[PDB]
Write a protein that binds this ligand. Sequence first.
Ligand SMILES: O[C@@H]1[C@@H](O)[C@@H](O)CO[C@H]1O
Length: 305
Amino acid sequence: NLKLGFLVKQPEEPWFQTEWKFADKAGKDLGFEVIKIAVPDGEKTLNAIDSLAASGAKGFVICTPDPKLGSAIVAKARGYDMKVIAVDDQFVNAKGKPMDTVPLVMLAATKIGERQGQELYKEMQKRGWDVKESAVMAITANELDTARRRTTGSMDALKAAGFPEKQIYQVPTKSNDIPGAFDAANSMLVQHPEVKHWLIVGMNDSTVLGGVRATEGQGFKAADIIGIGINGVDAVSELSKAQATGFYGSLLPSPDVHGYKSSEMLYNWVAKDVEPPKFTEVTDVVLITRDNFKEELEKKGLGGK
Ligand SMILES: O[C@@H]1[C@@H](O)[C@@H](O)CO[C@H]1O
């Protein structure tokens, strides 16, 4: 019957895999088919839209691989009389200004970053580290707004709790994955031999995990590393390991809400011209660690751990 696209930039992340599963549920409930397409670069993104048009889709939810493609995506969709909703990553114009007219569903980036820095600080205090020999490694992706509000939020929180600003070191990552973060973290680590304990800040689980893998290769044991990711679902294989690592826990948001609600809203828009809210910020978050990740995922219906 009705076909709707669900396009994501990183199909390998459990985060997006979960959005896809909940979109399928929305399709089962409301009576539409979801076409699941991977759009890891700009080219694929525009070609995928043409492909959706050929398939007869009336609209799509999309997590763009590049916010600056916003204009192009809007132009092509209009050309095909397709409605568009953005999930997680906001479209921006050439200048970098947000395209506020496109409905957006996303997590509360600032608030969850702040919660990341509060939980880092707390766990540091629990361990008794001497602040004088401690440092924060912030692995940033500042060209991505959502990534930038999380890492700024986290650094702001650490500063607000009393962590010395001069011991916060930032390093850019070229890709939002383990290899990009690994590389980034490694170059920062050799510049700071004086540090005995590291807090690793990054916008998501993969970034933090690459930071943690680099620390391991430079000789730090788990007690001297605290990394708290963001996404939850993406850290299950780490939390499931037999031995504890420097990856202490993850902040679990609601990818399930993002996949169903964006899909449901697209459908009401397509099927009834019910126009969606322009901005839907989901604030849900829970900290998962080795001790509770299974309880918490099951309690949220993201079962198996
Ligand atoms: O790439 C991140 C993704 O891993 C998830 O955290 C939602 O936001 C996107 O920007």
